[PDB]
Design a protein around this ligand. Structure first.
Ligand SMILES: OC[C@H]1O[C@H](O)[C@H](O)[C@@H](O)[C@H]1O
Ligand SMILES: [Cl-]
Length: 418
């Protein structure tokens, strides 16, 4: 039985080359250019983004590439390099929310979102996608697809939102709106902020209070693994997970009803009230006594402690306290498992193997219910822990996992013009 596979990121050259070839093969004409948005890892601050909390993503070197040409009419053609025979075709003229299904919903929905926002310059396009953000990995293949399309449409229609950070929040809202209202997949804003606003060697300290301007809601935190002789191990469990199954939405609804019983606009209000209390334990106790439901107490107890763990992680990493940073990873997972109840055996067992084989800490990243774990480990130990996870997986009768190199990489950009 064969060694655990590592999924190497497509280079600049491979992405441009493969995106354009799929373009020419499907459409015949050359694209106007090639754009790209990365997948992401969320280091800590999970199930916080839709509660107006704190998140800390990095962008992966792993990118979705779009070759795009705008069209004179309102028709949209899209093709994906995982099925280069199925061209999906749709029409923007009079298009309604939910008006496209399948994966074509996501990129079509981006033009739909921009025309809904009053960008009357935006008509149709042909696009070809090639990605190495693994599907079902919970590393935001979704956001990589929408944010690449949103940057391409901004560029070819000359909207003027692509060449600034502040500008991209308008493209981000469009990408978010495509996923929520066209693809009908509930999403909270973490993935698309990461994909369009992270920078190399930095994590994005994202504040999700919706009243904040773009300059107020991000801080670039130094995240140089080489400084501390670290490696970030990422292992996609490949556990089975129905893409959009209602679990994520139930969570959001419980939180939204938490906030209503509590009489706050959102749980970040509640979390900030507890944090600044002398006796945080007494502050959380008085909060949970207001929620009569056992499960709702646990969801709120997760969101309150998780926001504080983001502030605690940002301090720990800047101090070079990698033991303390690892413990914060461990506490975030443990909270996701017990209090939020979004883990599965594959995630728990992968984490336990990492823990018992010298990881500073390990945790599920993104939504849960499957997908990927992340581990702060010593440089040169990633392969060994990945292979230990794979061996356990086979002993368990689980599907084989796969691992990804990971480090803080660049956000969305244009890769090619002519
Ligand atoms: O941290 C939980 C996470 O789950 C998914 O990846 C969502 O799309 C994100 O917006 C975020 O809510
Ligand atoms: Cl096909």
């Amino acid at each position: 039985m064969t060694a655990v596979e590592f999924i190497e990121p497509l280079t600049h050259e491979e992405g441009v080359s493969q995106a354009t070839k799929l373009f020419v093969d499907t459409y015949g004409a050359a694209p106007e250019g090639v754009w790209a948005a990365p997948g992401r890892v969320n280091l800590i601050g999970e199930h916080t983004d839709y509660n107006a909390g704190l998140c800390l993503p990095i962008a992966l070197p792993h990118r979705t590439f779009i070759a795009l040409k705008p069209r004179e009419d309102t028709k949209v053609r899209v093709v994906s390099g995982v099925a280069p025979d199925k061209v999906a075709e749709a029409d923007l003229d009079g298009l309604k929310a939910r008006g496209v299904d399948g994966w074509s919903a996501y990129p079509t929905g981006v033009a739909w979102a921009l025309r809904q926002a009053g960008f009357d310059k935006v008509k149709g396009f042909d696009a070809a996608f090639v990605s190495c953000v693994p599907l079902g990995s919970g590393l935001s293949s979704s956001a990589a697809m929408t944010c690449s399309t949103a940057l391409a449409l901004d560029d070819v229609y000359g909207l003027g939102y692509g060449d600034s950070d502040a500008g991209r929040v308008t493209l981000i809202n469009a990408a978010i709106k495509s996923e929520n209202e066209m693809a009908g997949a509930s999403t909270g804003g973490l993935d698309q902020n990461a994909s369009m606003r992270c920078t190399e060697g930095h994590a994005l300290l994202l504040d999700c209070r919706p009243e904040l301007t773009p300059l107020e809601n991000v801080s670039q935190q130094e995240f140089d693994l080489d400084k501390y002789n670290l490696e970030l191990l990422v292992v996609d469990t490949q556990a089975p997970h129905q893409l959009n199954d209602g679990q994520y939405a139930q969570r959001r609804a419980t939180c939204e009803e938490a906030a209503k019983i509590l009489g706050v606009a959102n749980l970040r209000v509640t979390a900030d009230g507890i944090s600044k209390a002398d006796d945080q334990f007494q502050a959380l106790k008085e909060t949970l006594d207001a929620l009569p439901d056992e499960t709702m107490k646990k969801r709120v107890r997760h969101v309150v402690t998780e926001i504080e763990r983001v502030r605690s992680f940002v301090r720990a990493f800047a101090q070079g306290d990698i033991k303390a940073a690892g413990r914060l990873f461990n506490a975030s997972h443990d909270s996701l498992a017990a209090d939020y109840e979004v883990t599965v055996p594959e995630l728990d067992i992968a984490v336990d193997v990492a823990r018992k084989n010298g990881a500073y800490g390990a945790r599920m990243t993104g939504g849960g219910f499957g997908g990927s774990i992340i581990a702060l480990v010593d440089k040169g130990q990633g392969h060994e822990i990945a292979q230990k996870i794979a061996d356990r997986f086979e002993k368990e009768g689980f599907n084989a996992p796969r691992a990804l190199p990971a480090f803080a990489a660049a956000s969305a950009s244009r890769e090619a013009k002519l």
